[PDB]
Structure 1
Amino acid sequence: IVGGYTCGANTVPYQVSLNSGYHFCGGSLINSQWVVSAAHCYKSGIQVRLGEDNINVVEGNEQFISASKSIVHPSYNSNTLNNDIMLIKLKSAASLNSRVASISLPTSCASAGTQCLISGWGNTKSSGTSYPDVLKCLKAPILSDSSCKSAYPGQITSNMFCAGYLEGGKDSCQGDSGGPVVCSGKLQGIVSWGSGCAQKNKPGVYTKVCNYVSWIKQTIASN
């Protein structure tokens, strides 16, 4: 996250870190057994880390649970990033508490102008590289589909939305991928892609979670 703020420990209780020896992507806890992330974060050997603030220090609220199964969206296309969503099942159920909590799925899509919270352990610099140990947060609005499409000609599908600031300086970034965009208490986006980070006229692009609620629910119901 570039241009954000330190969230505070366990203030984003649905945020997970995906670990394969190291943090590599975010995700969102949606029930005691399942995490939502980006399909481009897929890899074998995932350990889901819940209850994290400093990802390099054991602080006392963590739950580390290996993934039993990952399900990339049936129609994910890694070239275009269309349908950049996956589900990860935990080998054991998380113990839910005030610091480890699921986030609700949306019932309808969000609208441009809606304020959201974006979070992660990704790069905090737009030129250069600095990875934080503690969780970072950014409040940002959803942008109109027309402004999104104009910013990224030929690239924005109906399964994507833009959020952030056209002036630059405030965005998600590499290492935030897979993490949450939460608006009014609902998971509306997944950190997906963008041109660099925090660049003028290049807002963040996010997977449009509302399009996937039926798939998520049916997948969980049979897995």
Structure 2
Amino acid sequence: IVGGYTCGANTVPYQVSLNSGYHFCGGSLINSQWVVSAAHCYKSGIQVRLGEDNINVVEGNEQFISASKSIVHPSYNSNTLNNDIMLIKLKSAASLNSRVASISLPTSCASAGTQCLISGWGNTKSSGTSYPDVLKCLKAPILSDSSCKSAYPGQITSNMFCAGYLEGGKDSCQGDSGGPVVCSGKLQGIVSWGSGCAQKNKPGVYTKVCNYVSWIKQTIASN
């Protein structure tokens, strides 16, 4: 997150870190057995880390649980990042508490202009690199689809939306991949892609979660 702030420990209790020896992606807890992340975060050997604030210090509220199964969206296209969404099953159910909580799925999509919270452990610099160890937060509005498509001609699909600031300085970034965009109490996006980070007229592009709720619900019910 570039241009954001320190959230504070466990103030985003649905935020997960995916670990394969190291943090490599975010995710969102949607019930005690399942996480949703980006398809481009797929890899073998994932451990889900819940209850995290400093990802390099054991502070006392963590739960580390191996994934038993990954399900990348059937229609994910890695070349275009269309349908950039993936479900991860936990080997054992998380113990849900005030620091380890699920986020609700949308009943409908969010409107342009709605303010959202984006969070993660990704790079905080727009030029160069610095990775935080505690969780960072950013308030950002959803942008109109027209502004989104003008920024990225021919590359935006119905399964994507932009959020952020066209003037630059505030955005998600590498390492935030797979993490949540929460608006009005619902998971509406997943950190997916963009051009650089926090560059002018290149806002963040997010997987449009409201298009996948039926797939998510049916998939979790059958797995």
TM-score (norm 1): 1.00
Where does residue 132 of structure 1 map in the other structure? 132
Q: CA deviation at 1:200?
A: 0.1
SS at match of 2:195: coil
Whole-Å Cα distance in 2 between the matches of residues 126 and 82 of structure 1?
25
Q: CA deviation at 1:74?
A: 0.1
Q: CA deviation at 1:203?
A: 0.1
Whole-Å Cα distance in 1 between the matches of residues 202 and 111 of structure 2?
19
Question: Are 2:77 and 1:77 aligned?
Answer: yes
Q: CA deviation at 1:82?
A: 0.1
Deviations 1:31-69 (A, max 9, x none): 000000000000000000000000000000000000000
Aligned length: 223
Where does residue 221 of structure 2 map in the other structure? 221
Deviations 1:108-149 (A, max 9, x none): 000000000000000000100000000000000000001000
Whole-Å Cα distance in 2 between the matches of residues 97 and 139 of structure 1?
25
SS at match of 1:218: helix
Question: Are 2:86 and 1:93 aligned?
Answer: no
Q: CA deviation at 1:163?
A: 0.0
Unaligned runs of at least 5 residues, structure 1: none
Whole-Å Cα distance in 2 between the matches of residues 205 and 91 of structure 1?
31
Whole-Å Cα distance in 2 between the matches of residues 83 and 152 of structure 1?
17
Whole-Å Cα distance in 2 between the matches of residues 184 and 123 of structure 1?
26
Deviations 1:1-50 (A, max 9, x none): 00000000000000000000000000000000000000000000000000
TM-score (norm 2): 1.00
- The aligned runs of 1:1-223 (5 Å cut-off) are 1-223=1-223
Large movers: runs of 4+ above 2 Å: none
Deviations 1:65-113 (A, max 9, x none): 0000000000000000000000000000000000000000000000000
Q: CA deviation at 1:193?
A: 0.1
Q: CA deviation at 1:204?
A: 0.1
Whole-Å Cα distance in 1 between the matches of residues 39 and 22 of structure 2?
18
Whole-Å Cα distance in 2 between the matches of residues 213 and 106 of structure 1?
7
Could you tell me the percent identity over the aligned residues? 100
What is the CA RMSD across the aligned residues, in angstroms? 0.2
Whole-Å Cα distance in 2 between the matches of residues 145 and 111 of structure 1?
10
SS at match of 1:117: strand
